[PDB]
Amino acid sequence: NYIVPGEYRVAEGEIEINAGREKTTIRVSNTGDRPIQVGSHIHFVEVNKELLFDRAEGIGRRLNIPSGTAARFEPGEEMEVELTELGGNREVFGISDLTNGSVDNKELILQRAKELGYKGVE
């Protein structure tokens, strides 16, 4: 009976994000001495050079977290994160300039990443 002006009455259930897309869990470490925070929609292979992880496993992917949230790595901190697949045309331009085209070009992306010192290229 009490009226909260403008209140919501939400439906039952839950919302599944990024439904139907492959998910991948990887370990990532901040080898730097300042904190690194990573948003939900950055192409994961293009994050800060000083994050150490299997860079190939970030290609064509991003964090599987709610839109507009982030994962925070304090200095020296290692965490497991879950990635989802990029959608749409599966192309990335700009950011760190590692892709500039289809994410399918894994060898080129990794060659650029290695030459520029992004940690974790095999």
Partner: protein, 570 residues
Amino acid sequence: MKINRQQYAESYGPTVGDQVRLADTDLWIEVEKDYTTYGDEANFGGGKVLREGMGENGTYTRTENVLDLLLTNALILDYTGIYKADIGVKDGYIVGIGKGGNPDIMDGVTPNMIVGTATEVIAAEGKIVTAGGIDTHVHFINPDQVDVALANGITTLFGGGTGPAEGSKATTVTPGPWNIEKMLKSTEGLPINVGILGKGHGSSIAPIMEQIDAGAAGLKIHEDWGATPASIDRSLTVADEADVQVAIHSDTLNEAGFLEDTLRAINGRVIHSFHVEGAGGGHAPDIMAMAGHPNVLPSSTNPTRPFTVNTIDEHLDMLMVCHHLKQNIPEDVAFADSRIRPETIAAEDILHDLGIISMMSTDALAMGRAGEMVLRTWQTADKMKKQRGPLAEEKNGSDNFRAKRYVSKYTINPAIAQGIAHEVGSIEEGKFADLVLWEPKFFGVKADRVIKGGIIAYAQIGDPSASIPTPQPVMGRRMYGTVGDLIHDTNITFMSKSSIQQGVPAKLGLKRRIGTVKNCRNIGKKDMKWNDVTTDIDINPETYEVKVDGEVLTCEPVKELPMAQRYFLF
């Protein structure tokens, strides 16, 4: 990875099946569908999604499917639906309703809704977004009335007047070519859309028609200038030739005819019946029967909306002032008293709820309140839910049917009636980006931000000296869309086809966008969205009892309304 619904709605606004209370009313709207792809919602800010290479595309130039403005996560309330979408604006118009962002990486992006370098962002998550209100019964009496209207979500003013002259204080009339030209030039400084009505009075065609050619967008027939069979007839002959609308305030006195005589003079032609209940004017006591006819587009003005315990007592002195009447002339008082009837006011509530009265309007400053058209629409809907129950058409416990029926009364239907719905009156692709954001707690009471032609024109915002815009005092203020020459690009002056063809804008130096009035004469009650009912309305001449389908229409006045003392400082 799943998110519960409470947290989802907090972060992105509600989604399918969620309900939202309208202000402090009992009315609940339910999200019918959602254009998003869950996980790819657009949002802007520090570390958020609309960033270069991410939700913002870094490749395309403005002309390549990129927006000037994206409203993210809007809950749209419109005659077309109640639903969740992003809204994309370009060149001052709504170009996309759907899902915005970056096709590079997001699923489900509407192809012409790319967020690019050229794109500004307004966050609509947690807001209700409606079309700007279309007020077709405006007396231009005091320029301070514009901000009053903007603050309650009105974005178009149709009517007439030259300021506080007695003719204008009584009638929505800007008379003759010279007054029309002067007011078209005044309009260059009014931060709202405008159309001007000429005097629908005369017994020869040329004095009436020359107002249309001078730039009027329609005509007003008003009893204070003689709402005679001749003036009715000549005005409609002009309107049929010029493709503009005629509004009527009929002969309350029944001096030259009764209602049936006015209808015979109309002779089946299209007309907009103002304040059809009749307190604001018209054949006493039975004018409201006009709302049953297929050629009548019927509106109410707002002081009778809805029926409350104080409604009757305010009206006599209001009417006497408006119409320049004298307390010491008994027949002036008798005329005023003849217009004020609880029986027809009560029935007017029900006729709105049944879709028999199709439109709301203010009657600003001449028996009406410039900033209460939207407000009183929702108070009426709430009263009718309380007294009549959910409409039979509703489902899942929502009030969506009633919400569509009522929002149409002050958005799309006045636009259709006036011949301007190709430009304004609804949230649809291809229409001008006149949009109102509301916090649900303030819905219908005080607008958050009023967008005009794609730029914010009015906003409730705080201390201009502060570190951020939210500290007190938060008040309604004109924004950059109203400043300098931007007032020209964010507002439309609506004009007749003939005045446009004859070059009136260039002659007068008008810089505002010029809107064409058209498709006014080939419509009827059937074209009023969600409010298309024709029926035989019987009004007893002795008792004023109103019958439809053999049933008396009556309801009680209420002592209290929502959207009232919880909100207002005075």
